[PDB]
Design a protein around this ligand. Structure first.
Ligand SMILES: NC(=O)c1ccc[n+]([C@@H]2O[C@H](COP(=O)([O-])OP(=O)(O)OC[C@H]3O[C@@H](n4cnc5c(N)ncnc54)[C@H](O)[C@@H]3O)[C@@H](O)[C@H]2O)c1
Ligand SMILES: NC(=O)c1ccc[n+]([C@@H]2O[C@H](COP(=O)([O-])OP(=O)(O)OC[C@H]3O[C@@H](n4cnc5c(N)ncnc54)[C@H](O)[C@@H]3O)[C@@H](O)[C@H]2O)c1
Ligand SMILES: NC(=O)c1ccc[n+]([C@@H]2O[C@H](COP(=O)([O-])OP(=O)(O)OC[C@H]3O[C@@H](n4cnc5c(N)ncnc54)[C@H](O)[C@@H]3O)[C@@H](O)[C@H]2O)c1
Ligand SMILES: NC(=O)c1ccc[n+]([C@@H]2O[C@H](COP(=O)([O-])OP(=O)(O)OC[C@H]3O[C@@H](n4cnc5c(N)ncnc54)[C@H](O)[C@@H]3O)[C@@H](O)[C@H]2O)c1
Ligand SMILES: O=C(O)/C=C\C(=O)O
Ligand SMILES: O=C(O)/C=C\C(=O)O
Ligand SMILES: O=C(O)/C=C\C(=O)O
Ligand SMILES: O=C(O)/C=C\C(=O)O
Ligand code: NA
Lengths: 308, 308, 308, 308
């Protein structure tokens, strides 16, 4: 069976195990630095299997050795943000956590695809590839699938149609400078601009950019985890089942969109090989101005990162 | 529980019950004019429930009375075509079958949404609305969902990506004059033209138009049923769960696209009310020439129909 | 669409919405006293719908008015225990909370089936039937499914088989005096005794009874929720779909097993009418001794209740 | 991805691909002697993937070379019976067909688990083990699951409960002497006798044994396929996923139940190694009398076999 290790048994990590367990994709190992929490959640999720009717070996541990030879490593060990806080504000703390987790996990699963979740996403994914020394295409960050999910939900709501017939690409760093792409958004093949007037669409775009903060302000004591976990799980599945999914993820660029040496949200084809191909959309001038704005923001965090 | 009556327990009818049963959408009644066939298939499908683990009341009958008060009526009682035959070639035979089924079923389920499948699709759907006297929006034909499914499969194959991230609109009568719309086809929001060169895409378009014949030539003794049944079931589900799905179906037009008094494949929003809204895409000159060609073909069958 | 209100959007209530959403059973309303909490969780979960592909309306609220006309009401507003506590220890705080939630919701959804979860389960379920005045059959408590789930899990683990083939009846109050029934537990119709040695089976019976506490001692700051939520969800589904599932639930006894006027974990046929039948099993003396000892523990919580 | 080859693309084989596709277990190869048949059905089913949303490679072929390196081989090439025939009546024609299919496929997929379906089931499964020379554990016949499925269905129907709660062991040869075991059949762990009266239960035991013929007499031009396919699929899944399901399958006995050198319907733990364990149940005299009578009917088909 496939082996999936989730490093950090917090809200996102545990919910990822939940979405995953239901798909019967393989053994799931929940690791955490706090004793009892992963073991407890693992056992509890395990005990639900007879009810839901899924066969899954879910275990919790505080020992990295238990993650050895994993096919996929999900990193959700970073500290979350509190209201009135920015994802980059977490960089110093999460950089240490991320470095700690990667340096211990990577060596034990050299053939694993690492899916980073810790914020700030782009900078942490970059730090992961950097610490693991893994092939760039096997070190990616979850962000775009979530961002686009929010965006697609808002448009489905606004248009009054099933979220099943809604697709939308979105690029950039996982932050305020985020860049949803209305031109690359459709409903059963039809441009969304045909369904939503410019003013409403622009609001939707703004809501998408602040989507994470919106939830943080409501919860007060934590950040989102249902959508984020669902996104992470869709990526794990893409990899384990080599589905060749076309989705936005934080991938290492070497010139695409005119950007180099940076993890940035771009559309890719996800499969057993991890990032199998980085798509290069024909973005117009407006879109590119937005994209470049985001690029500059991410670059900023990298400069912060490199000085830590 | 919701009640779904499938008139005609042949290949498409039975496979529809199969796709449906697995979704637990309600009671399923399989009706046929031949004794034993529906009862046999009903019982056999019923006996699979303990294995698949779905609760469904599937019954077979030769008595229309058993279809009374159905929420949805699926009509798959028409005679299929043999190789080297055209769907319109079935018009005379299937017109009588269709008239017979509708006149007996409709009265028993006045509040039902009728989903026609019998070929020639557009002309038979028109005959159904005509015989049932039902509100035009509650009498629709399955065709576009199938045609587009074929089209989406070919592009997924060609592009090497999951069929999950592929959407494509397609219009016109369910025939050779069919009109897939590459401009209204995307992969995770991205135009397919970005993935498939014009020559290959044009082949895909041609294959889509002949997709049904392709399968007929292979099977020799019958026509497709897996995809067709899956399409019909997706529509039944859209209705029963009021999903507001954006999909192409044969709907009654009153001026849309410049067409009037005709059942034609157009994108609609499908829900509890049946055809809840007919979308009007901004089709360019080329697309419209194609659309008008298809319109003329359908009109021809209607003229044939009306003279029967 | 059906409507399900979940009073108390904490771990169990939110997780319950999660399992439920994936099932597309109908609209879900998450209510809580803390503002923002239910709104954020409902939005977060709603934003996962495009990723997972389900059409579900999940809303968060602080106003009982939003729960009006619900078909089912899940109550998960109770405070959870910490290590060292018994479920009975929560009776003072939760009797108040429970009375508050039921007095407000019940009047608004007169035809609903109320499913209690708050601990102590059997007492709280009695209280809810009392405060609501609803027919006893439409007021039930979730406990048996969860308890039997832990039991079935330990069995599958021990026998090295799939949980999908393990069935097991479990009776009594949701507490330490809980009565797992080895003689009424089978693997694909084969008595469990044929797979597990008595001594081992005994340890399993014991682990089952102490299952909740095992998790509490691991989590340390909360109690189980994945299995509990799954259990609650299955019950919600049984009612909404009128599945007529045979399962153990805290129901109102009027003489069965020689017990009167108490809510007790017994096997029932759960459907659209709530408890549609209470099964009276031919328990033997050893089993009846365990059952009576449990009914005694329950009656004791009820006397504490009436004392509040 | 895993690979599954289905030899014989008729009703059972095609339907088996259908159930399988929906499960996304891996690539499926439909093979047949008639050209076009497997190609059309595989394409048709493949074109349903966008509608249903599964990523499955389904190919049709007439060349055994395409079945190379399969993980599992389903054999459904046998001729089906017509009203008036017994399954044994097909032994001459199907022994030939079966030998032909196994001699060609087995050599190409040496590590595969072969699952026979062709009737007479027990004899054909023995033949396949013989012609293939594969370890007996990796050659099994599908029969028990289907037989017990019909039984569980009749029970649920009679008891007015959900098939999801009915378990039932069934042993012996896949013929009239089939042995459903009431004493080894439970509803949520509760003996079936507690729900159905002996006289009624007897009629059910009898209906089960004659289940196949009931359908044959209804269809008239073929035999059951939905349940058979579902049964076969569950077995394929058990192997591919290494679920360790406890179920009745025609396995090779070397003394169990005092039977040697025959393929017989017995309970086993089915996993990645095929039959990983044969369970020896404490049947009583009445049950052993039925079992022996069945083993006699089976030995008789084997003597007919060796006579071909
Ligand atoms: N990229 C996205 O789209 C996205 C979405 C949501 C959350 N996030 C981010 O993901 C992270 C996790 O969010 P959360 O809400 O689940 O947080 P959380 O606080 O609930 O969980 C983090 C878990 O990590 C564990 N942990 C800490 N150090 C560890 C170490 N060295 N090894 C192993 N485990 C360790 C903690 O003990 C804790 O259980 C945050 O940084 C958050 O900002 C990103
Ligand atoms: N619109 C599409 O996209 C689409 C796709 C596939 C097939 N079709 C069409 O659907 C029809 C059914 O195809 P099939 O392959 O399932 O055929 P089939 O021959 O397998 O089944 C038709 C069934 O109708 C029954 N029948 C005949 N007259 C009846 C009456 N008066 N009442 C009740 N039942 C009656 C038959 O006995 C038979 O079992 C054909 O007309 C075919 O061309 C349309
Ligand atoms: N098998 C069972 O029956 C079972 C299983 C698990 C938990 N439980 C019990 O269920 C309850 C919930 O457990 P939890 O872990 O989810 O707790 P929790 O603390 O996470 O959540 C309870 C939620 O109720 C809310 N709340 C409080 N008063 C309220 C009121 N008047 N109206 C609406 N909401 C209100 C809180 O603000 C909180 O969000 C506990 O009492 C626990 O012991 C029972
Ligand atoms: N419970 C069971 O074990 C069970 C259940 C149902 C059916 N069956 C048996 O399974 C067989 C299939 O039933 P069916 O209804 O699908 O029949 P069918 O006639 O529909 O299909 C059999 C297919 O095998 C093909 N075939 C013939 N010779 C072949 C060869 N040498 N190689 C490859 N393909 C070949 C045919 O052309 C045909 O498409 C029958 O023998 C039937 O009695 C067993
Ligand atoms: O905002 C957060 O911290 C987490 C959700 C997200 O990254 O979108
Ligand atoms: O071609 C046929 O007759 C049936 C399949 C379709 O209508 O596409
Ligand atoms: O142990 C607890 O408090 C909650 C879980 C349960 O009721 O089993
Ligand atoms: O009755 C038949 O021939 C096939 C179905 C079965 O084997 O039960
Ligand atoms: Na477009």
């Amino acid at each position: 069976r496939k082996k999936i290790s989730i490093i950090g048994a917090g809200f996102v990590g545990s919910t990822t195990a939940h979405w995953l367990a239901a798909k019967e994709l393989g053994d799931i190992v929940l690791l955490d630095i706090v004793e009892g929490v992963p073991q407890g959640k693992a056992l509890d999720l395990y005990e639900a299997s007879p009810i839901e009717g899924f066969d899954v070996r879910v275990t919790g541990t505080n020992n990295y050795a238990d993650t050895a030879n994993s096919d996929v490593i999900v990193v959700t060990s970073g500290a979350p943000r509190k209201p009135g806080m920015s994802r980059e504000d977490l960089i110093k703390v999460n950089a240490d956590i991320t470095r700690a987790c990667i340096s211990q996990a990577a060596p034990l699963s050299p053939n694993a695809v690492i899916i980073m979740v810790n914020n700030p996403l782009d900078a942490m994914t970059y730090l992961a590839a950097e610490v693991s020394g893994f092939p760039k295409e096997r070190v990616i960050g979850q962000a775009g699938v979530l961002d686009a999910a929010r965006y697609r939900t808002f448009i489905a709501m606004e248009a009054g149609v099933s979220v099943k017939d809604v697709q939308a690409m979105l690029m950039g760093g996982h932050g305020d400078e985020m860049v949803p792409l209305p031109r690359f958004s459709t409903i059963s093949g039809i441009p969304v601009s045909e369904f939503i007037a410019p003013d409403r669409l622009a609001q939707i775009v703004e809501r998408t950019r602040k989507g994470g903060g919106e939830i943080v302000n409501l919860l007060k004591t934590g950040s989102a985890y249902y959508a984020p976990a669902a996104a992470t799980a869709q990526m794990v599945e893409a990899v384990l089942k080599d589905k060749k999914r076309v989705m936005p993820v934080a991938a290492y660029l070497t010139g695409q969109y005119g950007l180099n040496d940076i993890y940035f949200g771009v559309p890719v084809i996800l499969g057993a090989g991890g990032v199998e191909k980085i798509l290069e959309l024909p973005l117009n001038e407006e879109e590119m101005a937005l994209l470049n704005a985001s690029a500059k923001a991410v670059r900023a965090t990298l400069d912060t990162l490199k000085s830590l």
